[PDB]
Design a protein around this ligand. Structure first.
Ligand code: POQ
Ligand code: AGA
Ligand code: BGL
Ligand code: BGL
Ligand code: BGL
Lengths: 227, 227, 227, 227
């Protein structure tokens, strides 16, 4: 079990660190920044790379909504669920913790305002998208993400390619909804950075818990049911 | 059969949502938009990801030109073609629907004006290209795309890699022809967003439903015949 | 050996069409251009996609220096050499032709002047490098290209991945040279477009035959001797 | 064992020449420059391609920290450690040497003033990050990298996908840190270009030997201990 939890912690820690890291440290860098499309890749890679390395230990979740989604899909044990979620959330915090430290080594940093790569909606959305839009897009993408995970993990799917699917799947998702909610689909990755924003990010933090979980559950049931 | 239909439906939905969705949400974002290459990647990824996820169910077409292209080349049962094509068009439209709703959360959005990521040519070509150009490009790419599909699915090609190839083929295609026609090579995709543009998008819609399927068949036959 | 040459022809076409195509049409589009890196991806993506498609038919060369190289390496029969190359150069020119036609569709185009994605050195070096620099870099990336081809195809290399390895390999090479010579490392491609330039493109072309093919040999022997 | 050393040597050469190449030759370049994101992909690719190519000959380290890290993970014999490092460092220097020659071809170039893609911190950090911040990323991303390298190569991990995991993992590392330290995480890479800076680059060179090797060893101990 430990292995499983450690796998899930470093996994997520890696997700956040690389994800919000590129987000914070390189995304809008003066002239050579990696923009949204860079951050999009980054995130996916944290999952593509971590899935290979430790996926074979836990399940390569690194996401609460993926742990809960795989559950509603009949793939994951309801017993081990909670642990997995804590582990993911803990790893994420430890990540944003260092990230924050690292980000401070530069003049002008500020977790608040900058948002510390926190997710939000309306007035707190990158594009200024309505909460509703943030709801619709998060849902579809969360559902679709589990829909792809269950598919790439289905015993009839090209074995060993799963990580690539799931990985790049997250890159896709980002390329899509950054302007809306700065992309979440992961209540662990959203909590981690909110903690260090400690403002609106924490107020809307709930949103990025219910919404992703619900959608992942739909994605799971959609696969368990219609396949 | 239903699975095969649901698979193709969700698959296309993913395609229109991810591809068109990124183009209508992030491609032109201020200082961090993903640009064309951004969109190109995303598009190919919807395919690469669903190609793995549900590829092992419906064969992973998601494109009416791909299905008919396979039939032509002699790999898909003519007795199933129309079933897939419906599922796909329906899927794509559901996507365009949600995308439409989502894009409206940001003040100042206008489907018709903006183009809702529809395909066109001349006066409607992103780079303002002739129709002759739109015709040649879409044709060649469509063919090549189908040939790549046939060759990648040949019993002698590396097993399981297909999805990586076919998806990256579509990214390659979008990197080459977004300035021209905004890259279609998919009737169901073109239809979905066009409907929400109402105007000229539907006015040239036929173009991206004849040219694309023609090329797909030429490509299919190219391989079935010569290899 | 028809099937082989057919493949070797369509492939090269897809290469010159997708690479130079992306260069001339997208690359520097008003404000969403795929840029140098976009091209770089595209170029590689052509080889990655065709290797999977017809690689299982002709060995997926699509490059004179990759055939001469495989020969020097001792993987390709000297017999089938001249045949491949012919096909490779042919298919390329047919692509550059169609591209030319497509490129002329936009008001303002001009094959000469713009350069039509041809390769050159100094006065014709994208960044205006010396011929010496042009030489050294074309030499290192040719040899390296082959060493990676030979290796990724050694009976002891991860089977089925070669296409990815060689494809992304080309991308890497384009990410590096571009500013120097627009990245050749393929006598076939350099020719195709040089023809339609009809100016210096042809004048310096000789350079883009001897240098890549010499390098391709260096690499062949390199891996064939020391591994 | 000469093959293994030749393998590690060309590998690393391909690494420095490829990454530092794209870096000092393309990242900047006018309106098309590949910037950090391009440079990031590049480096990753050099590893990915060479990993498939000669990875089956030496284990594909191309990084002193990655060789010493593996050693700590109980995956590499200490006897061969010192040999590998010499190979890698020599291969790197040779790359910087030519790359130096190539960049010098363009009018107006000063390896010194330009930095020549050297790693540094504080006054020499691209984004002006403090040494503490430098220390932290470098450390984390090194232990992380080495960790991913272990899991991807675990007997229970997906066979053959390692080179994709690792190489892509390095691209990630670069997406997150370039602003900070310009991303070393490889003592052989740092050394190579420093030599041709010959000012501050060498001045801080030590830091990029101890930090990434400490990180790399911790990484492995983590996998050795917690798997
Ligand atoms: C099962 C869970 O496994 P983990 O997810 O926890 O991950 C491992 C760490 O265990 C290993 O020590 C390192 C090097 O990193 P170092 O761990 O931070 O420790 C050495 C060290 O001493 C602290 O007191 C400083 O504290 P703060 O985070 O409180 O500062 C906040 C502003 C810290 O910055 C410094 O790096 O790399 C991590 O990824
Ligand atoms: C032109 C239109 C039709 C196309 O040729 O193909 C036929 C498919 O179905 C539809 O017209 C309907 C969408 C309701 C299929 O062959
Ligand atoms: C060190 C851990 C910090 C958690 C603090 O979180 C935020 C800060 O990042 C912000 O700049 C301000 C002022 O409001 C605080 O609550
Ligand atoms: C910086 C602290 C570095 C601790 C490094 C671990 O070092 C130990 C060696 O000392 C031991 O003999 C070998 C045996 O295979 O196992 C290693 O992991
Ligand atoms: C293990 C990484 C150790 C990093 C140690 C910091 O090392 C630096 C020195 O190199 C520098 O010259 C002095 C000046 O007062 O400041 C120290 O903090």
């Amino acid at each position: 079990m430990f292995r499983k939890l450690a796998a899930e912690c470093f996994g997520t820690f890696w997700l956040v660190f690389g994800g919000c890291g590129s987000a914070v440290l390189a995304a809008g860098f003066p002239e050579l920044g990696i923009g949204f499309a860079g951050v999009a890749l980054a995130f996916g890679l944290t999952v593509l790379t971590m899935a290979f390395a430790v996926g074979h230990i836990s399940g390569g979740h690194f996401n609460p909504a993926v742990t809960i989604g795989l559950w509603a899909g009949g793939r994951f044990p309801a017993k081990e669920v909670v642990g997995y979620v804590i582990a993911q959330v803990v790893g994420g915090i430890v990540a944003a913790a260092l990230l924050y430290l690292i980000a401070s080594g530069k003049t002008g940093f500020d977790a608040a305002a900058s948002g510390f790569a926190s997710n939000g909606y309306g007035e707190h959305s990158p594009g200024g998208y309505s909460m509703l839009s943030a709801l619709v897009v998060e849902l579809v993408l969360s559902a679709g993400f589990l829909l792809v995970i269950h598919g790439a993990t289905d015993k009839f799917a090209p074995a060993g390619f799963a990580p690539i699917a799931i990985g790049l799947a997250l890159t896709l998702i980002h390329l899509i909804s950054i302007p809306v909610t700065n992309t979440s689909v992961n209540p662990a990755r959203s909590t981690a950075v909110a903690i260090f924003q400690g403002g609106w990010a924490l107020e809307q933090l709930w949103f990025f818990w219910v919404v992703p979980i619900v959608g992942g559950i739909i994605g799971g049931l959609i696969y368990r049911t219609l396949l």
